[PDB]
Amino acid sequence: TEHDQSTDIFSADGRVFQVEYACKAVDNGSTAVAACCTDGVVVAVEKILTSRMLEEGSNDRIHAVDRQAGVCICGMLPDGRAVVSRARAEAENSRDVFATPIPGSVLASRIGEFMHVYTTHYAYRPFGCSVIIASYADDGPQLFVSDPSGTVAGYYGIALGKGKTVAKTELEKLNFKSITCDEAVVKLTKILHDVHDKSKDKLYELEVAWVCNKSNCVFQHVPNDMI
Amino acid sequence: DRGVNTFSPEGRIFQIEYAIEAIKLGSTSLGIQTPDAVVIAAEKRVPSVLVDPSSMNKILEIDYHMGTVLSGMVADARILVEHARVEAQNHRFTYDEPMRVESCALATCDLSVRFGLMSRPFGVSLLIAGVDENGPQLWQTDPSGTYTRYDAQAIGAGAEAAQTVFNEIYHRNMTVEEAETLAVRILKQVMEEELTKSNIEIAIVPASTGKLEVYDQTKIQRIIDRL
Amino acid sequence: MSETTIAFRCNGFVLVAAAGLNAFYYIKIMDTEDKVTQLDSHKVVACAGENGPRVNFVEYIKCNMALKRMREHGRVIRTSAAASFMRNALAGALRSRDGAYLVNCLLAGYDVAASSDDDIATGPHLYYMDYLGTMQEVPYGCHGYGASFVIAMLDRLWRPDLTAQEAVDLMQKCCDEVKKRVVISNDKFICKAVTENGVEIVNTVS
Amino acid sequence: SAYGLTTFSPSGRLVQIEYATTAASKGTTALGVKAMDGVVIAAEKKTTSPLAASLTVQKVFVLDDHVGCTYSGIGPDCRVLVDAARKACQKYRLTYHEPMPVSQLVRHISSLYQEFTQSGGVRPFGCSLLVAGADSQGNHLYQVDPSGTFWAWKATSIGKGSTDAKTFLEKRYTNEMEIEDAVHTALLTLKEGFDGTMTAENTQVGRVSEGKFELFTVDQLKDYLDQI
Amino acid sequence: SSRYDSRTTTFSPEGRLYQVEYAEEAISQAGTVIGILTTGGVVLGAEKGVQNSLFDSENMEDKNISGEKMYKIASHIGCSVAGVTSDAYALLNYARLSANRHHYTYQEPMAAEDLCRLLCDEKQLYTQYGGVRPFGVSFLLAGWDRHHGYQLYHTDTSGNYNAWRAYAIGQNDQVAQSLLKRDWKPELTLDEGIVLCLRVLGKTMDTVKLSAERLEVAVLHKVPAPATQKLLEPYGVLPKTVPEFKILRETDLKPLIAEADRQREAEEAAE
Amino acid sequence: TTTLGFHFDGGIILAVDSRASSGQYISSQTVMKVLEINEYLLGTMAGGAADCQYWERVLGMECRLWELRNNCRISVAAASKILANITYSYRNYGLSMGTMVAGWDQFGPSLYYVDDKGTRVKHELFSVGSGSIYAYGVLDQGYRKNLTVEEACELARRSIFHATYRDGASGGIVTVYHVHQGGWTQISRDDQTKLYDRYVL
Amino acid sequence: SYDRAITVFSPDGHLFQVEYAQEAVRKGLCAVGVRGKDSIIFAVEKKSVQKLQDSRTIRKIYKLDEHIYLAFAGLSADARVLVNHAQLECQRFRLNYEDAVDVDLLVRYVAKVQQKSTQSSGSRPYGVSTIIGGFNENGQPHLWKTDPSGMSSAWRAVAIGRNDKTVLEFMEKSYQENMTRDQCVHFAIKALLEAVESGSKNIELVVLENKKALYMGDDELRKFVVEVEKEREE
Amino acid sequence: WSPYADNGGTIAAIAGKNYVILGGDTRLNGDFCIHTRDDRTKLFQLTEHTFLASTGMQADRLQLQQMLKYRIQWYQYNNGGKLPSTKAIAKLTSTMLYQRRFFPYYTFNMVVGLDEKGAGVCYSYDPVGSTEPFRYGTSGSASSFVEPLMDCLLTRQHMELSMTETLEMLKNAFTGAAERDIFTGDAVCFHIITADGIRSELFELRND
Amino acid sequence: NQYDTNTTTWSPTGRLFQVEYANEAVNNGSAAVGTKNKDFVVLTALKRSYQEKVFKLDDHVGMAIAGLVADGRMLARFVRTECMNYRYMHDSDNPLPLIAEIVGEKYQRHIQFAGKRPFGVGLLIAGYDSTGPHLYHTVPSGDVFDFKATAMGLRSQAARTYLEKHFESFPDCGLDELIMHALKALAAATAELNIKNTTIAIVGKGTPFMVLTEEAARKYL
């Protein structure tokens, strides 16, 4: 069992255990959900509070990375913040060098590449976060997830963290072709209130954001009255 | 086996804890501050009668108004004192005035902490004694890069004993004679050999003149006899 | 060329002379600087140029020769090897960032057997060098404005079998002709002989 | 990583160099024969399956117009030595405007093997080479091993079937063979150790003659196989 | 990755450097090598391995630069090696480069003890800095210079060197060192030295007759100086004799092997 | 500017004027041109004020470190050598400097000249600056080794005076220092216009 | 570039790499220095007498400059590297300051090189202790010792290497101030023969006087040894 | 294109037994024109007892003011919160100017403040940093007028003032300079520095 | 424990132990408190032979530390330098939200690479900018929390218990009652509080970051 001490070693079965362990940190974190409508994309996440004395906005998990795109972090927040910085730099590079807003599919593939490189070298460890990427540039609305292995995929709806098995069940009873961004906020918030476990985590709040036609394809937090 | 940067489970850095153990196996050194002056003194401890005692000074000049006594590893201490000397002359070069004692303590601690580059911390603590516009002062530096002001302090093997003699006799208001005497008393007790006049060092910095004076053999004996 | 240097070898010695002058534009500061420098027990170099380059060049050669001595059981190095090292330092500097050392030298030595295994031909040697790194063994040679006058005299009067007394006389005539014909004042000379017994000052020449 | 992976052991052995030499001695069989007017080298190229294209598999390489090589052991390791050798030959022509002698090329290769037995962070190469070529001093055949040691030979073999091949060559070798009799002898020696039927598609052959090195095509090799 | 570092340059608990000791054990397993100091030169002799029939010559144009065991470093310095062969080639190139740079800078030959000291400093470096194994080589060096005449040095895996009148490294070096301690004398000639070398190799190999195919012999001696072109170099001075390193062939050894077999048959008679 | 120094039986005298001029406008009449490096060594400035003041302060710092590390005073030969190495390393960078360095060490009194190209010379008498060409006239007439301290101070004072009276770039106050075994003393400061009234008789 | 930490503290304040270096020194051959009125003697044990060794012995006392010599104990190859550094520093000092280097200042440079080897990543300490002696430009003699940690001290007589502690007890009793050049040579030979077996060709010796150095020949040394072997019988 | 521009104008100061008075004009000149008549960048406060005053190129005095402000902030962080004296700042300034020897600030600077005894002092610098302590000083386009006048009225070599009388002399010197130098005019800002604090005042000059 | 030696090793349950242990350095430092009302922030600290615990970072911002002092000083020099550059380029105060972000990001670089050690220190950063008063707490894991009141160090649970009762009343408090609530919270984590073992620091509207002198602190102790 020396094979699980660094990310630069395969096990006999063809696995990389340090990356699996990093994934377990995401699976024990707070729940997130997201949905891709015909207008846009909506993201929502549960924040577990550690004190009743925090200001509002503390330890935000959702961050803008360009005018038209945003990221939500699951698992370890300071690791997520390092990925947010990288993503900001790739979006700026696309505007400065190629004179375009970065397409959603390209942004997700660069984030994946960046995360993968920390699974290859004896001197670094894998990130302990999964990132939800939400974008609306010239390729339409797009929602992607990148995990600690650096694997990247596109979704119509998705859930992450410790409530994900149940939350997935409830996202399967939505109609993705038809739904608008105002309905979505009500349904997504409901799923998150229902999976919350009241024994373990006593204090919590919800954080919600979107990018859609209503907002002029600007990625932003929803106004706190719509919850 | 476990690296140079590792923390223990109660939050201490192991190499720094061990460096502090090496200092408790040193020759004994101490200092006493009065309103008139500051006094420093050290057990010499030569290995044989064939050694010239001149060559084994434990009390060094940094500049006209400041001196040091060292404990622990002598060769490591010479690196630190060379740095303190170079800093005190750079301050005169640039600003045409003597360097304050506290600033010189601070500069020595900024060198002592650059390891992870050097393979290990310095196994040294200094007592620095001087005079500036805030009067006579006594500072201690240690391998953690912390510096602290004291009224009376001892370092090395006889340290624990000498803090019981200080907790009895030391009041903040003594004279030069009472402190000179308290010094040679503590040394007699915690030493191994019999206390001659060529087996210890003493120095003073007085508020009056503000220069450092290292006592000869002649003048030390007057303080043995007064006992 | 404000300072003249002269040298010549005969059967058991080399004589070397150089002018004492140090100047600042048109003012004489002093006229007694010794520019014939001793490199080891049986070697001297006479250099012409400004004080800064002259002194920094001879201290660099002296240091490397002392180092080489102690990593060799303290044995005297041959004159041709010292000449070769100097030439290589002058030529090196010419293609370096700081530029050439503006000095012109004459190197003289007397080679002596190291041990009983040594099959070296013992004798005096004299090498002319210039600031670019040119180096040539010669029977006599000169640098400075006075050089051309003295060379012609030596072409007329020098022989290999001059005695020590005839040679000292011949060096005094050479120095007098520099004083007679060169506008720049070279009023005092210092002279040294290199022989099988080492390096000595010749006091009767000035 | 910058520490050494190859180290001495209590009896003075360097075991990673032995283990690398064991990997070389389990490769498929190659051999070489020096005649009085040239040199031949040959190697087996059996594929694992008939879904593999035979044509593209290379066991014999041109290093320059006068010299070539073959290998046994780990193929991807051999490619690194073949690229370094090609480069050295061209660098020698740029400086002296003549072909690099085979003695100098072998020494260049040998010093690249020696670095991977000592530098930090690397294991040794796991292949032996046979090098064959022509220069001003004549025709040459050399062997180089993972230690970096090299030898000049009249005939030899490397790889799995190498002991039986060397016993067979010791009997049939003479100092007065012509080049064409050497090609015959080389192909006969392979056939002895070969598991299955030797064809012009599953074997490869190269030849030095008249100062040039050339791979046989499949067609040329078929003519020689129909005579043996 | 740091948990798999073997720590090659780390002291162990009696001030020992284990990699340096283990490399010394490798030397003691190699072919025997002998050196002898005479009044006419230095002799170096080596045992070659068993001689297969399929071995070939490199057919080099000049024959006195390298054999199997003997290498020229400069016109006045030669050597012979025991240990890891490819490591020897790396240090041999370093020595060749050092000795010829000295001649570039001073236009005279490098002293023998100086070349030996540079070589040993290159070995010491790998025992103190840089995390890799040391070289596994020992050299006998033969030289001539104007300071001390003929010299014979030996170098070891720690980077230490010493000077010798006769010496042996490799396999049977305690047996060889005992026979030399008996039969060496201050008044040996070059030919008497070569015979004394063949008889010592004869004994350690353990064959009654000396195979001329299983030995190698080199000498460092002084020969008449060649041309003296005073037209092209008007101030060039050569001496009468110059050093030369020579590798003896099978037509120079034939008479000297005879003399070594007769002295072997007259030492088996008295017993 | 005018500075001079010489070595006599009783030590070393140094003397200077005090004007700073571009070449037309006079920026000051009260520059101090003798630098008290420490208490056993003196320097002088001519050429660029800033260059002499900065690098002499550097040299004073190097002397004090030497004293801390070795527990004894640096020699004049070493101090002057430290300054000449610096100027030599900057010989292509356009400094302007003509300094004397004076002191009394275990070999006795020593006087050196050091310039901006790495020059370094040891001798019994120097004058430096644009007024030097007038001061050498008076000084070479009166200099001998057997002067008393009072005579030597007078000779130095009268020489700087005659330079100030003829050279446009020299003037102001004449200052004399004496370097002896116990260190150094400032002997005198006198306005050159008061001196005119004492010497015109 | 290998940059591993080699010399580290362990749990009771020990630096093991430095103590192991000090063990290599105690295994080494014995060396002795003795300061007289106007002379310094250095004497060293040699590996052994052999028929096959070359008569011209390799020197184990080194010259650092005209006026400074060095002897050592420990790993001979590490000592040669330290000697090389100190030779360059002596010449760098002449180039920068013109004067010849003082002995105490050259000893500080060497001690600082040893100390750095105990704190630099990627390298082990030198396994060497040195004895360094010389004269200043005012005829006063100095004698110093350095250890592998970088600690330096001045002595009147001192010993290092194997049986250092025995030779040091002998020297503590018998040493007298202000001895002659010949009385010093006697005292040093005598001290060495507490550790060493015979006194034939297993001693080399250097006598250093203000402006003169001498590697003693075999004949002058034989004379001094028999005189000492006679007095050890009494 | 040159990296240098001269923006014109004049500064002056006079020290007393326990005050110093310092003045700078407010015009900023371009090439053959005027950018503004109300520039305040010539005087710059460093502590409550010490000012920098500069003439020459305006962009270079802006850089030098900021470099000094940051070195003085570091001094307080390394010295227990305490501020450097006027003499300490004067030596720092000398050292900073010489370290740019090879592409120098195009500035003529003064440091003025109170010393430790509480008396006024003025340090004037050439552009690579040579200086000395003095009782008065001036630099800039009108300095060759103002300086001989200050020599005449304050030292009197050819023949103790109140704060009030000293300030009147400077008012009259600037009025004269504004009439005869084409690059000096519009207004003077005066600072009076005492142990208590710093008083300010604006004074009008001719506008042509 | 096979997973507690390096920062680059995840354990099988998804934890990073070396980072949990650096966080114990903070929890064993001496206690410090912070509180804020509509327009001020107050910090108090137990400084007992005087040991420096509070540092000014610019005119508008300062901090208290707990844990390893030499790491404290290294972060103080970094934030100082950042605030000086911001003012050079903009002529205004560096916004407090950007200070808290660069500090968080610098902690995190030291928990992901084998050639760096985690910082073993916790900061309370207090400042005042164009959007009002701010109080942030930072820890060795790289997290940053924005608070109305909190406490860190030894026995800081008692201080936190006291602040949970009163904090909802702090917006309406004046500067004098706010200072008193901060000392009564620090008292709960404790000999009693004098002017020689307690620091008080303040920053706010019309008030640059300052540490009370012993004279000014008498009024409250």
PDB file of N, CA, C and O in Angstrom, chain I residues 49-70:
ATOM      1  N   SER I  49       8.797  42.715  28.981  1.00  0.00           N
ATOM      2  CA  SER I  49       8.581  41.392  28.336  1.00  0.00           C
ATOM      3  C   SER I  49       7.361  41.507  27.407  1.00  0.00           C
ATOM      4  O   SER I  49       6.398  40.745  27.492  1.00  0.00           O
ATOM      5  N   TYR I  50       7.444  42.492  26.499  1.00  0.00           N
ATOM      6  CA  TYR I  50       6.363  42.901  25.607  1.00  0.00           C
ATOM      7  C   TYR I  50       6.473  42.125  24.287  1.00  0.00           C
ATOM      8  O   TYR I  50       7.552  42.100  23.693  1.00  0.00           O
ATOM      9  N   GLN I  51       5.369  41.494  23.831  1.00  0.00           N
ATOM     10  CA  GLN I  51       5.379  40.721  22.588  1.00  0.00           C
ATOM     11  C   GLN I  51       4.378  41.307  21.586  1.00  0.00           C
ATOM     12  O   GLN I  51       3.179  41.329  21.848  1.00  0.00           O
ATOM     13  N   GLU I  52       4.892  41.724  20.414  1.00  0.00           N
ATOM     14  CA  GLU I  52       4.153  42.485  19.409  1.00  0.00           C
ATOM     15  C   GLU I  52       3.108  41.615  18.703  1.00  0.00           C
ATOM     16  O   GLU I  52       3.444  40.615  18.068  1.00  0.00           O
ATOM     17  N   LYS I  53       1.846  42.032  18.770  1.00  0.00           N
ATOM     18  CA  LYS I  53       0.749  41.245  18.243  1.00  0.00           C
ATOM     19  C   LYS I  53      -0.107  42.005  17.207  1.00  0.00           C
ATOM     20  O   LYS I  53      -0.884  41.394  16.495  1.00  0.00           O
ATOM     21  N   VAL I  54       0.009  43.338  17.142  1.00  0.00           N
ATOM     22  CA  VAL I  54      -0.764  44.186  16.261  1.00  0.00           C
ATOM     23  C   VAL I  54       0.160  45.013  15.382  1.00  0.00           C
ATOM     24  O   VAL I  54       1.168  45.504  15.861  1.00  0.00           O
ATOM     25  N   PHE I  55      -0.204  45.133  14.102  1.00  0.00           N
ATOM     26  CA  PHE I  55       0.601  45.744  13.068  1.00  0.00           C
ATOM     27  C   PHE I  55      -0.242  46.612  12.147  1.00  0.00           C
ATOM     28  O   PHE I  55      -1.239  46.149  11.631  1.00  0.00           O
ATOM     29  N   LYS I  56       0.212  47.830  11.864  1.00  0.00           N
ATOM     30  CA  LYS I  56      -0.382  48.709  10.872  1.00  0.00           C
ATOM     31  C   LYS I  56      -0.010  48.282   9.447  1.00  0.00           C
ATOM     32  O   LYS I  56       1.142  47.973   9.181  1.00  0.00           O
ATOM     33  N   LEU I  57      -0.963  48.243   8.516  1.00  0.00           N
ATOM     34  CA  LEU I  57      -0.597  47.841   7.168  1.00  0.00           C
ATOM     35  C   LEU I  57      -0.671  48.993   6.169  1.00  0.00           C
ATOM     36  O   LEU I  57      -0.090  48.893   5.110  1.00  0.00           O
ATOM     37  N   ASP I  58      -1.402  50.056   6.470  1.00  0.00           N
ATOM     38  CA  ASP I  58      -1.504  51.249   5.635  1.00  0.00           C
ATOM     39  C   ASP I  58      -2.346  52.194   6.475  1.00  0.00           C
ATOM     40  O   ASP I  58      -2.772  51.807   7.551  1.00  0.00           O
ATOM     41  N   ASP I  59      -2.671  53.387   5.969  1.00  0.00           N
ATOM     42  CA  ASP I  59      -3.426  54.360   6.754  1.00  0.00           C
ATOM     43  C   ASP I  59      -4.811  53.849   7.128  1.00  0.00           C
ATOM     44  O   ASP I  59      -5.365  54.248   8.134  1.00  0.00           O
ATOM     45  N   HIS I  60      -5.381  52.958   6.315  1.00  0.00           N
ATOM     46  CA  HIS I  60      -6.787  52.613   6.443  1.00  0.00           C
ATOM     47  C   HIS I  60      -6.984  51.172   6.932  1.00  0.00           C
ATOM     48  O   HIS I  60      -8.126  50.694   6.937  1.00  0.00           O
ATOM     49  N   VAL I  61      -5.899  50.490   7.324  1.00  0.00           N
ATOM     50  CA  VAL I  61      -6.001  49.062   7.586  1.00  0.00           C
ATOM     51  C   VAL I  61      -4.876  48.542   8.467  1.00  0.00           C
ATOM     52  O   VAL I  61      -3.749  48.963   8.336  1.00  0.00           O
ATOM     53  N   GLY I  62      -5.201  47.600   9.339  1.00  0.00           N
ATOM     54  CA  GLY I  62      -4.221  46.918  10.175  1.00  0.00           C
ATOM     55  C   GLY I  62      -4.662  45.494  10.527  1.00  0.00           C
ATOM     56  O   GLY I  62      -5.730  45.081  10.084  1.00  0.00           O
ATOM     57  N   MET I  63      -3.877  44.779  11.365  1.00  0.00           N
ATOM     58  CA  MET I  63      -4.269  43.434  11.784  1.00  0.00           C
ATOM     59  C   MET I  63      -3.711  42.998  13.141  1.00  0.00           C
ATOM     60  O   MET I  63      -2.683  43.493  13.566  1.00  0.00           O
ATOM     61  N   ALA I  64      -4.350  41.985  13.743  1.00  0.00           N
ATOM     62  CA  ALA I  64      -3.791  41.208  14.840  1.00  0.00           C
ATOM     63  C   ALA I  64      -3.414  39.794  14.393  1.00  0.00           C
ATOM     64  O   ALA I  64      -4.102  39.221  13.567  1.00  0.00           O
ATOM     65  N   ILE I  65      -2.343  39.215  14.943  1.00  0.00           N
ATOM     66  CA  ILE I  65      -1.985  37.852  14.593  1.00  0.00           C
ATOM     67  C   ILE I  65      -2.094  36.887  15.774  1.00  0.00           C
ATOM     68  O   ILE I  65      -2.158  37.343  16.909  1.00  0.00           O
ATOM     69  N   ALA I  66      -2.158  35.573  15.467  1.00  0.00           N
ATOM     70  CA  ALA I  66      -2.041  34.478  16.428  1.00  0.00           C
ATOM     71  C   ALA I  66      -1.336  33.279  15.793  1.00  0.00           C
ATOM     72  O   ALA I  66      -1.727  32.870  14.708  1.00  0.00           O
ATOM     73  N   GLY I  67      -0.316  32.722  16.465  1.00  0.00           N
ATOM     74  CA  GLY I  67       0.469  31.607  15.955  1.00  0.00           C
ATOM     75  C   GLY I  67       1.929  31.993  15.751  1.00  0.00           C
ATOM     76  O   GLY I  67       2.464  32.777  16.509  1.00  0.00           O
ATOM     77  N   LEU I  68       2.554  31.544  14.673  1.00  0.00           N
ATOM     78  CA  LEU I  68       3.964  31.812  14.470  1.00  0.00           C
ATOM     79  C   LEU I  68       4.223  33.261  14.050  1.00  0.00           C
ATOM     80  O   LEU I  68       3.913  33.672  12.942  1.00  0.00           O
ATOM     81  N   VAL I  69       4.921  34.008  14.904  1.00  0.00           N
ATOM     82  CA  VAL I  69       5.217  35.406  14.637  1.00  0.00           C
ATOM     83  C   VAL I  69       6.065  35.603  13.381  1.00  0.00           C
ATOM     84  O   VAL I  69       5.859  36.577  12.665  1.00  0.00           O
ATOM     85  N   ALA I  70       7.031  34.743  13.082  1.00  0.00           N
ATOM     86  CA  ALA I  70       7.848  35.047  11.920  1.00  0.00           C
ATOM     87  C   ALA I  70       7.031  34.924  10.625  1.00  0.00           C
ATOM     88  O   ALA I  70       7.340  35.639   9.658  1.00  0.00           O
TER      89      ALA I  70
END
